[PDB]
Amino acid sequence: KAKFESEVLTRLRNMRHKIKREDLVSIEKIIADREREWERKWEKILGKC
């Protein structure tokens, strides 16, 4: 029982680490690029922020 529950804990940690270090880093980079591309595009068209 102790060994099995330990495995469950490790699975949860691996899942959280995968979400925080892999999945959210990739998504946040895409969001930041998109927000910058957008701000540049309209700043050029409007001559102001």
Sites for other proteins among residues 15-44 (CB under 8 A): none
Specify the residue, 9 or 27, whose C-beta has the smaller distance to other proteins: 9
> How does DSSP assign 1-49, residue by residue?
-HHHHHHHHHHHHHHHHHIIIIIHHHHHHHHHHHHHHHHHHHHHHHS--
User: Can residue 1 be called a binding residue for other proteins (CB under 8 A)?
Assistant: yes
User: Can residue 12 be called a binding residue for other proteins (CB under 8 A)?
Assistant: no
- Stretch of residues binding other proteins (CB under 8 A), selected from 1-9, 15-23, 28-36, 40-48: 1-9
